[PDB]
From a paper:
Replication in eukaryotes utilizes CMG helicase (Cdc45−Mcm2-7−GINS), leading and lagging strand DNA polymerases (Pol) ε and δ, Pol α-primase, PCNA clamps, the RFC clamp loader, and numerous accessory factors of less defined function. Ctf4 (Chromosome Transmission Fidelity 4) is a homo-trimer (Ctf43) that connects Pol α-primase and CMG helicase. The structures of the C-half of Ctf4 and its human orthologue AND1 reveal a disc-shaped constitutive trimer via the β-propeller domains on the N-terminal face (N-face) with the three C-terminal helical domains interacting with up to three CIP peptides on the C-face. We sought to address these questions by a combination of biochemistry and cryo-EM and found that one Ctf43 binds CMG very tight, not dynamic, and can bind 1, 2, or 3 CMG holoenzymes without steric hinderance at a 120° angle to one another.
Density scans of fractions within the SEC elution profile indicated a heterogeneous mixture of CMG–Ctf43 complexes, with CMG:Ctf43 ratios ranging from 3:1 to 1:1. Therefore, one Ctf43 may organize up to three CMGs. Indeed, we observed 2D class averages that show two or three CMGs per Ctf43, related by the three-fold axis of Ctf43. The current report demonstrates that two (or three) CMG can bind Ctf4 tightly, that CMGs bound to the Ctf4 trimer retain activity, and that a complex of 2(CMG–Pol ε)–1Ctf43–1Pol α-primase spontaneously assembles in vitro.
Numbering used by the authors:
A (entry chain h): 201 to 706, 737 to 864
B (entry chain i): 217 to 324
C (entry chain i): 433 to 540
D (entry chain k): 24 to 103, 130 to 198, 201 to 211, 235 to 305, 319 to 339, 346 to 643, 647 to 693
E (entry chain e): 326 to 436, 462 to 591, 597 to 650
F (entry chain l): 260 to 414, 428 to 463
The structure:
């Protein structure tokens, strides 16, 4: 009709005129910034999702898509006054929708659900590639005009007719070849991810038809969730079952987000919002020019563990990392830093590895049994009947910056350890079993939580007597962080009084008021909480690259080599050309957190006084003499 | 497609009945003549083909005079005419990415 | 070359449908061996499934097979030439001269 | 329209820079030796050719061959009939959007790709000039089908006054072009997040086919048009590239220009090649002089004798590197990969050693068993590189026993039994039983049971760990200069331009020097090595009586003669001498002693 | 924005930020702000031989109809210029703006007291291959300097951004002093023609308002033995408003310090704006300069 | 907005699956058994408003039977009938179902004699209530089902020997066979 023309006018002001949370113009910020990258996306803010939903929910479920087509043409004129001339540049925008209040999954889809907004999860299984789609059908008569305008074709329905508005004969509509733009089209079939499911049963299948600017966002194997509509278009021809009055479902998606974790939130961490422009970026500078930050940050990472310092420092260093630095026509340089935790059965080593999995951006958690040598890296899944022997990755090629686990699968130790110690040595490893000879790229990070046979001091005898590993696979790491406690009165209460208070930690204003309660409960000592702390990590890994000096580096060459001599003349396991490459690397990880690109003097001694003590303390009874050595190094 | 040279109008027929009369047609098979038909693929002599590829192959249609002469594993040397056959591009419509020119050797 | 896939003396019922309605027991490796010689290597570096095949073709001149088709006794006059290596280096003199490869004495 | 034709026949007979009259001066040179092809050059072609491409961008798929009809009409001017049509080859270079922007603004525009070609299909034929018969009315015509929208640009009509579709394809007066469907693969370095690479397809014309082997870097320029195969939702089609010209890098079949070999002969007379390469091969390797010399002789090789009898010798050498972790046996191996003409890198875990050499599978068409895959057949003429020779016991040893020492495999799987050629050269780098204990015990315990692989390789290095207090500090002084500061990248660029050799110069002269000269050693050396061996065996013979067993047998004695033939390929002298051969044993006499201690 | 007709609207992105280094930044806002005016068109591989050669005349017009509405509002008039051009009939259009740029860089690269002789024999020799650049006979050596030039700026900007972020510029009282004690790639600072350009980039980082102390800098660098230290001075600059007579004050002071003690000071280099110093003399150099106010 | 169904339950007599031939057509017979291999949830139609776009396609036609892809009865004006149809998604209510196989119980199997089975369609709110793996009872209406051989790509035993009599309908000469199947209305699981 015509009253929707006013509806577009009425919502447009209802969008841009208001910004929640003390102004600072939020909705005006999303638009101009995703103009500056030219990437065709918009959002819906959560606190005024629902107030933009309340007078529009009855105009959501009644019509979800034609409301969107008239929702789109106002966003052109929204930005057109702001940025002109988005016409010669791709001439096209379409909106997206943020998180929605709905829990349900694939098991619950009724006839009442269709032609409406739906949200559902799953795992992406085997997919196809990218094709072009016609999307603008210029129809062609034979006798009369062979140009009928670039049409508005549907989804997979093959819209055509016999004769209209030219004649009434059986001259079929054909094609010609000019000025028909093409979008792309990528059909991912979906399996239900076997997480929240009443177990012991089968998966179920659906179909997802993506759209133009949503191509190849996901990968074959992670878990995702979609925010699509529920269109049920088919003629009524089916051939695995007989013909019947039956219809098949097709979920046309509208947006996509990634693997989510710790599903307990109420008003945040449901979207990777990740826009740091006026208030956030001004703030992130003044949090970076302070004189105690790297002393404050590593104390602020693990919120709920009162342990010793160095393990937090190394696990701070691991997810920060250095540089996969380039080189000329010569050998490349490892840009990864890999740590190893040795512990006792009963300290908190199994939790810091758990906690870093949430705080990282992407991860995987292959632990314990079942870690097959083909299963971690790439494998070759066989073909169906008219198909070809293709290449399907496993763990590592997904996890670019993540976590594995090798503690002590004693039987399956000799199976896969010949596949992970060539992931670091021959860094970026891939293989050619019975197929193609390619090589993928995987600059992955390894942590591990190995376990000595019994107690932590199973001997005064050295580490080759203690662990069951041999030397070379052990020598790929940087440091063997080891734990210890026998008997201490004051140290035990410093854990014991600490741990019991953690168990004591068991509507628009109220949604805000619960948040301040959620903010105060983390702020007993206020150690810079996780609402902002993870958010600057992701651009501390993708925006800053450090560089070095020369005049301060050569002062540690004798500090290396004279410590190389005492460790070679007296050694359990030796340092080599390997360790010194980690010496300069974990130095510049620290200065990467000053956000500053340089390397100082204040850090190299800090980086040295992490490594040397954490090497020497694992030796023997004869450690009290070596502590008389290291203060000369300091 | 056996006269080896002239592309005549084919006869898409197996056997006719009822010539222009009211007589039930009879056929004398002793005075009807026959011939045989055998295809064989030939690999490459895998010593003089230089090391950049697997062996390739083509095929050859011969006649009765030298059948059963070719045991698999013989250094053979044939000579014949080079010949294409088959309709490429019209016998189906839209014909996209389908060769319709089979290499054949009708030789001796 | 003694690469010991199943096919050293058999067919494995490979027919390829032979133009829609013809099934052929395609000759693997004995139509070439007839009144000739063969040679194969690496006896102990083989699986079990070839060793059962070399049992039959030595006690009997013929193989006979019915895989998904026809029982057929086709004849073969073969003569193998062997090449294997001892296992434990230079251990022939300090131990028994027999069992020095310990492959089954069905062939020895 | 037409007349464009008059804008180009009046354009290529006079375009020149200052008094060289180039395009007639090469077309004349190209009609003579039969190639029938062109290229285009620079800017004004671009300068007004965009002013033609502003009327060619609308359809650069039908009026690209409207160039093609023109140059035949200038061709007959240089003749005075047997005249074929021509083809085009292009050139353009600004950058390389690898595989990202591929549906929006890139249908039928000129694209440039960088890829690694992996798979060739067998040839085929499509026609370009036909003759057509009406059936019962006997019309005769001829249609030419030049450029494409894959098949069916135009069809055959119904009008001859005879019946419907009366048209047939004779084969008496016909020409043919060949296509490929070779497959292209993304260069595996440009888009890393977590993804797997994808692949496209392309065809070509005959006077640019068979110009690529699988396993090379390549660049390519062409169109992004779309076909539609009817062997999946709405009427969707597929992508493919129509290529035009491969202005590749080198082949990496020995034809090239002459100024390349001029400097090579000017370098080869300066007799400092043997010592200057060891500094200039690996600009990132502290010393290691005994190992470094083994690599340059491995890359070039010896010869091959098909001497007037039946048998043959094997002209190749194969080295090993076993030692402690942290002695750069790994990262040295990536360094030989880029410098080789043909190299693969399958260095890990064997990768199903039965499926290393051959694979057969069922087929989508005709359900057949043919040969497809292999790691060796791809890698002929060059060098492979593998590792981990401790924890592979399954099939890795039973797959290389035949693949080495005679280099003549034949697969006896369900289809064929064919002896395909092989002239490969292997390389490996394993670990002993955690290194130190094999250098602190009886000298056994290297391979778990068998030494029979160890007799099949000749050259073996056994590195170790010293503690010399002056050589480490230099190394600790070395690697900080190469890590950060990149000052030796400014230093080695300063000793490059008069003294050293970069990477792109080493590759090009190795394929030249191997494929030209053919050495032979002098009979004066025959007394030299014979007197050498009898005490070498005796030095072994005095060791066995002391109850010391293990391994030396006679393959090494016929391996030293390939080693002394190797530097004769380096100097490109058709003989071999005594200061030649005394330095050669000086490499191997050094590796005889470590076979004992 | 230079060398456009020869090439690289890509590496214009650096020296567009040079022009925004003339405005109020060196990296921060521009690496957002450039992305309104630039990546509007993705910059191709084949037709970019035609689009930023030919139909950038649709876009030079478009900047011509962008900056006319950036004229009464922005008013930054360092971009539109009259200039001059020439052509050769064919072989592209080459103006004289970019042409002087190739001649500078090609003069630079293109190659006791025992090192200075083998350093002085270089600069005469590489001079010589620039003098014959004025024929048509040099074509495939003409582009050699061109591809040399668009890395040298990428080389020189690589360290200019370093010495900013080090924050070692100190306004003591009169001037600002900076001593590049050590960084990477020190070799490209022996030949003095690069140094005035480094100052030419460095005089424009301080070309903001600065409504007091319009005094240029004095830098310092060393590559070779005995601390040669080819120290130099610059000129102050005007933001297109010379009314005051500002030539130089340093050469008057350069006569003074050279007249004092002759304790290994040298003026053997030709231009008076460059001298040498010893390492233990640069610190009593400035103490003689912070009191001798001769402006 | 109102759509109903009729749910009987608790007839006295409970049979087994081997007792269903002659009198059991159109009857009501409670049946026990155990269930295996469910399937998914798709929608059905039972009524449409599709019509041809000849003049006006707003004819709510009838007879959504087992071959219901042709609404061709009583067009609106004097127009062209059975010329088209447009099954809109906007006006015809649907109902959701799943197809399951059952199997005979373990305390009745005489010998190991390849225990036979049959299939059953459940169509109301009965959807996703038969959890696979329990001794279950059912409603009871028995039903036959054909295949009409629609416009799709296709059109040992002497099956359809009955169907050779079923030739010569007004549409094309073929053989329409049959198979006994089951329609339910109401589930229970005592056990
Ligand atoms: N210092 C500590 N602070 C808080 N909680 C702790 C501490 N040490 C242990 N715990 C608690 O003890 C529980 C037992 O897990 P624990 O970390 O001991 O496993 P683990 O011994 O590390 O396992 P694994 O040996 O497999 O790594 C944890 O859930 C953790 O909450
Ligand atoms: N002799 C050497 N000269 C220069 N660099 C060396 C040398 N030996 C080792 N390196 C350096 O070691 C660095 C990392 O190599 P890496 O530690 O992976 O060796 P590795 O693979 O552990 O040795 P191995 O193969 O014996 O296990 C490389 O950057 C390389 O430059």
């Amino acid at each position: 009709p015509n009253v929707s023309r006013t509806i577009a006018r009425e919502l447009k002001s209802f969008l841009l005129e208001y910004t929640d949370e003390t102004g600072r113009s939020v909705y005006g910020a999303r638009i101009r910034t995703l103009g500056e990258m030219n990437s065709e996306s918009l959002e819906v803010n959560y606190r005024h999702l629902a107030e933009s939903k309340a007078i529009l929910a009855l105009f959501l479920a009644k019509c979800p898509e034609e409301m969107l087509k008239i929702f789109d043409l106002v966003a052109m004129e929204a930005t057109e006054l702001h940025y002109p001339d988005y016409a010669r540049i791709h001439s096209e925008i379409h909106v997206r929708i943020s998180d929605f209040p709905t829990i349900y999954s694939l098991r619950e889809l009724r006839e009442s659900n269709l032609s409406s907004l739906v949200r559902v999860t799953g795992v992406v299984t085997r997919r196809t590639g990218v094709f072009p789609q016609l999307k603008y059908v210029k129809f062609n008569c034979l006798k009369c005009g062979s140009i009928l305008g670039p049409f508005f074709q549907d989804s997979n329905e093959e819209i055509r007719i016999s004769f209209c508005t030219n004649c009434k004969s059986k001259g079929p509509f054909r094609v010609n070849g000019e000025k028909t733009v093409y979008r792309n089209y990528q059909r991912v079939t979906l399996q239900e991810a076997p997480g929240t499911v009443p177990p012991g049963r089968l998966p179920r299948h659906r179909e997802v038809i993506l759209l133009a600017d949503l191509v190849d966002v996901s990968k074959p194997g992670e878990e995702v969730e979609v925010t699509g509509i529920y269109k049920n278009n088919y003629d009524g021809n089916l051939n695995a079952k007989n013909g019947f009055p039956v219809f098949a479902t097709i979920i046309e998606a509208n947006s996509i987000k990634r693997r989510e974790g710790n599903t307990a939130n109420e008003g945040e961490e449901g979207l990777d919002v990740f826009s740091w422009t006026e208030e956030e970026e001004r703030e992130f500078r003044k949090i970076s020019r302070d004189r105690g930050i790297i002393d404050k940050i590593i104390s602020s990472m693990a919120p709920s563990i009162y342990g010793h310092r160095d393990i937090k420092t190394a696990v701070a260093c691991s997810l920060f990392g250095g540089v996969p630095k380039n080189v000329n026509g010569k050998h490349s340089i490892r840009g990864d830093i890999n740590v190893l935790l040795l512990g006792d059965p009963g300290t908190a080593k199994s939790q810091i590895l758990k906690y870093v999995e949430k705080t990282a951006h992407r991860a995987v958690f292959a632990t314990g049994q079942g870690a097959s040598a083909v299963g971690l890296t790439a494998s070759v899944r066989k073909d169906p009947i008219t198909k070809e022997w293709t290449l399907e990755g496993g763990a590592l090629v997904l996890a670019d910056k993540g976590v594995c686990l090798i503690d002590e699968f004693d039987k399956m130790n000799d199976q896969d350890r010949t596949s992970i110690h060539e992931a670091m040595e021959q860094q970026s490893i891939s293989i050619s079993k019975a197929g193609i000879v390619t090589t993928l790229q995987a600059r992955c990070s390894i942590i591990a939580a190995a376990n000595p046979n019994g107690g932590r001091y199973n001997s005064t005898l050295p580490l080759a007597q203690n662990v069951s590993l041999t030397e070379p696979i052990l020598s790929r790491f940087d440091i063997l962080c080891v734990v210890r406690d026998l008997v201490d009165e004051e140290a035990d209460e410093r854990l014991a009084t600490f741990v019991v208070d953690s168990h004591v930690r068991s509507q628009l204003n109220a949604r805000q008021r619960r948040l301040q309660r959620q903010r105060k409960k983390e702020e007993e000592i206020s150690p810079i909480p996780q609402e902002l702390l993870m958010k600057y990590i992701h651009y501390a890994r993708t925006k800053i690259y450090p560089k070095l000096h020369q005049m301060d580096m050569d002062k540690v060459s004798r500090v290396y080599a004279d410590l190389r001599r005492e460790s070679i003349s007296t050694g359990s396991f030796p340092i080599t050309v390997r360790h010194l490459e980690s010496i300069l690397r974990i130095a510049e990880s620290f200065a990467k957190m000053r956000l500053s690109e340089f390397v100082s003097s204040y850090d190299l001694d800090r980086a040295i006084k992490v490594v040397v003590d954490s090497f020497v303390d694992a030796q023997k009874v004869s450690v009290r003499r070596q502590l008389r050595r290291s203060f000369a190094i300091y | 497609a056996t006269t080896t040279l002239t592309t005549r109008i084919p006869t898409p027929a197996i056997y006719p009945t009822e010539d222009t009369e009211g007589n039930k047609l009879t056929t004398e098979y002793g005075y009807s003549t026959f011939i045989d038909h055998q295809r064989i693929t030939v690999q490459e002599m895998p010593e003089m083909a230089p090391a950049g590829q697997l062996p390739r192959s083509i095929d050859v249609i011969l006649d009765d005079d030298l059948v059963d002469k070719t045991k698999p594993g013989d250094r053979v040397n044939v000579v014949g005419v080079f010949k294409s056959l088959g309709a490429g591009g019209m016998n189906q419509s839209n014909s996209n990415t389908l060769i319709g020119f089979k290499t054949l050797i009708l030789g001796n | 070359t003694g690469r010991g896939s199943s096919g050293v003396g058999l067919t494995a019922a490979v027919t390829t449908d032979r133009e829609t309605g013809e099934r052929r027991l395609e000759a693997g490796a004995m139509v070439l061996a007839d009144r000739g010689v063969v040679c194969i290597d690496e006896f102990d570096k083989m699986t079990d499934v070839d060793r059962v095949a070399i049992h039959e073709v030595m006690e009997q001149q013929t193989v006979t097979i019915a895989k998904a088709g026809i029982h057929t006794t086709l004849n073969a006059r073969c003569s193998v030439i062997a090449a294997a290596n001892p296992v434990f280096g230079q251990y022939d003199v300090n131990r028994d001269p027999h069992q020095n490869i310990a492959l089954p004495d069905s062939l020895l | 329209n037409t007349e464009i034709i008059k804008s180009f026949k009046n354009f290529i007979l006079e375009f020149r820079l200052d008094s060289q009259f180039i395009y007639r001066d090469q077309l004349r040179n190209n009609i003579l030796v039969k190639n029938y092809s062109l290229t285009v050059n620079m800017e004004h072609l671009i300068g007004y050719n965009e002013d033609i491409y502003k009327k060619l961008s609308d359809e650069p798929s039908d009026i690209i061959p409207l160039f093609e009809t023109a140059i035949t009409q200038v061709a007959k001017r240089i003749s005075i009939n047997s005249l074929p049509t021509f083809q085009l080859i292009l050139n353009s270079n600004a950058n390389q959007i690898p595989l990202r922007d591929l549906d929006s603004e890139h249908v039928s525009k000129i694209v440039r790709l960088s890829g690694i070609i992996i798979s060739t299909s067998v040839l085929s034929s499509r026609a370009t000039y036909l003759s057509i018969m009406c059936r019962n009315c006997r019309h005769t015509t001829s249609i030419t089908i030049n450029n494409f929208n894959t098949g069916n640009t135009v069809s055959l009509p119904r009008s001859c006054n005879c019946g419907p579709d009366p048209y047939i394809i004779i084969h008496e007066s016909s020409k043919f072009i060949d296509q490929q469907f070779l497959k292209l693969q993304e260069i595996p370095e440009l888009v890393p997040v977590g993804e797997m690479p994808r692949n496209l397809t392309m065809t070509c014309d005959r006077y640019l086919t068979n110009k690529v082997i699988p396993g090379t870097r390549v660049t390519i320029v062409g169109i992004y048009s779309i076909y539609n195969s009817k062997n999946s939702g709405v009427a969707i089609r597929t992508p493919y590239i129509k290529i035009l010209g491969i202005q590749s890098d080198v082949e990496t079949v020995t034809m090239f220009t002459e100024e390349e070999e001029e400097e090579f002969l000017q370098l080869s007379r300066n007799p400092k090649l043997y010592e200057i390469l060891t500094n200039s091969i690996a600009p990132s390797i502290f010393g290691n002089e005994d190992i470094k010399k083994a690599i340059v002789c491995l890359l070039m090789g010896g010869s091959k004798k098909i001497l007037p009898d039946g048998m043959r010798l094997r002209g190749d050498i194969n080295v090993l590197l076993l030692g402690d972790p942290g002695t750069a046996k790994s990262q040295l191996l990536k360094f030989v990969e880029k410098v080789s003409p043909i190299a693969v890198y399958t260095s890990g875990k064997g990768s199903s050693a039965a499926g290393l050499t051959a694979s057969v599978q069922r087929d989508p068409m005709t359900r057949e068993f043919y040969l497809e895959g292999g790691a060796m057949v791809l890698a002929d003429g060059g060098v492979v590189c593998i590792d981990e020779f401790d924890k592979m016991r399954d099939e890795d040893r039973v797959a290389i026993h035949e693949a080495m020492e005679q280099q003549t495999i034949s697969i006896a799987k369900a289809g064929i039994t064919t002896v395909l050629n092989s002239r490969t050269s292997v390389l490996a780098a394993a670990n002993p039983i955690y290194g130190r204990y094999d250098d602190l015990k009886s000298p056994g315990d290297n391979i778990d049971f068998q030494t029979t692989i160890l007799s099949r390789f000749d050259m073996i290095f056994i590195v170790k760990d010293d503690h010399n207090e002056e050589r480490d500090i230099s190394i600790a002084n070395h690697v900080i200069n190469i890590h950060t500061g990149n000052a030796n990248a400014m230093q080695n660029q300063q000793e490059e331009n008069g003294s050293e050799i970069s990477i792109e110069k080493m590759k090009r002269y190795i394929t030249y020097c191997r494929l030209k000269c053919a050495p032979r050693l002098s009979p004066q050396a025959a007394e030299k090595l014979s007197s050498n061996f009898v005490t070498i065996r005796k030095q072994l013979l005095i060791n066995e009586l002391e109850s010391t067993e293990r391994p030396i047998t006679i393959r090494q004695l016929e391996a030293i003669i390939r080693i002394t033939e190797s530097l004769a390929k380096l100097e490109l002298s058709p003989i071999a001498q005594e200061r030649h051969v005394d330095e050669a044993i000086r490499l191997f006499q050094a590796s005889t002693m470590d076979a004992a201690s | 924005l230079f060398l456009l007709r020869h090439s690289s609207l890509y590496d214009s992105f650096y020296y567009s930020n040079y022009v925004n280094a003339k405005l109020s930044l060196w990296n921060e806002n521009g690496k957002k702000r450039l992305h309104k005016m630039f990546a509007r068109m993705g910059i191709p591989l084949s037709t970019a031989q035609e689009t930023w050669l030919y139909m950038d005349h649709s876009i030079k017009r478009e900047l011509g109809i962008i900056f006319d509405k950036n004229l009464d509002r922005y008013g930054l008039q360092d971009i539109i210029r009259d200039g001059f051009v020439r052509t050769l009939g064919y072989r592209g259009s080459i103006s004289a703006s970019e042409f002087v740029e190739a001649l500078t860089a090609l003069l630079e690269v293109g190659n006791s007291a025992q090192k200075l002789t083998n350093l002085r024999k270089r600069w005469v020799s590489n001079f010589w291959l620039s003098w014959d650049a004025l024929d048509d006979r040099k074509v495939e050596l003409l582009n050699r300097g061109i591809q040399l030039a668009q890395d040298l700026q990428r080389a020189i900007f690589n360290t200019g951004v370093a010495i900013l972020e080090k924050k070692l510029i100190k306004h003591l009282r009169i001037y600002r002093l900076c001593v590049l004690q050590d960084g990477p790639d020190l070799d490209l600072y022996r030949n003095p023609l690069t140094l005035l350009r480094l100052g030419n980039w460095l005089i424009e980082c301080c070309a903001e308002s600065e409504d007091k102390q319009l005094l240029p800098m004095v830098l310092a660098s060393i590559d070779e033995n005995t601390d040669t230290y080819l120290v130099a001075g610059l000129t102050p600059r005007y933001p297109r408003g010379t009314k005051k007579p500002i030539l130089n004050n340093f050469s008057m002071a350069f006569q003074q310090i050279t007249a004092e003690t002759d304790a290994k000071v040298r003026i053997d280099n030709f231009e008076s704006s460059i001298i040498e110093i010893r390492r233990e003399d640069l610190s009593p150099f400035l103490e003689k300069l912070t009191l001798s106010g001769l402006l | 907005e109102r759509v109903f169904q009729i749910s009987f339950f608790n007839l006295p007599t409970v049979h087994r699956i081997r007792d269903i031939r002659s009198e059991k057509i159109g009857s009501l017979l409670s049946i026990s058994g155990t269930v295996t291999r469910t399937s998914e949830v798709r929608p059905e139609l039972y009524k449409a408003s599709f019509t041809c776009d000849m003049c006006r396609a707003i004819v709510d036609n009838v007879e959504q039977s087992f071959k219901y892809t042709e609404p061709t009865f009583c067009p609106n004006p004097s127009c062209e009938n059975r010329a088209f149809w447009t099954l809109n998604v906007t006006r015809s209510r649907f109902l959701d179902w799943q197809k399951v196989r059952i199997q005979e119980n373990a305390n009745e199997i005489p010998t190991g004699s390849m225990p036979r089975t049959l299939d059953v369609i459940l169509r109301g709110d009965s959807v996703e209530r038969a959890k696979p793996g329990d001794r279950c009872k059912f409603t009871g209406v028995e039903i036959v089902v054909p295949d009409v051989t629609q416009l799709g790509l296709p059109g040992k035993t002497t099956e359809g020997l009955n169907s050779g009599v079923t030739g010569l309908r007004s549409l094309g000469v073929r053989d329409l066979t049959y198979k006994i199947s089951f329609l339910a209305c109401h589930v229970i699981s005592i056990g």
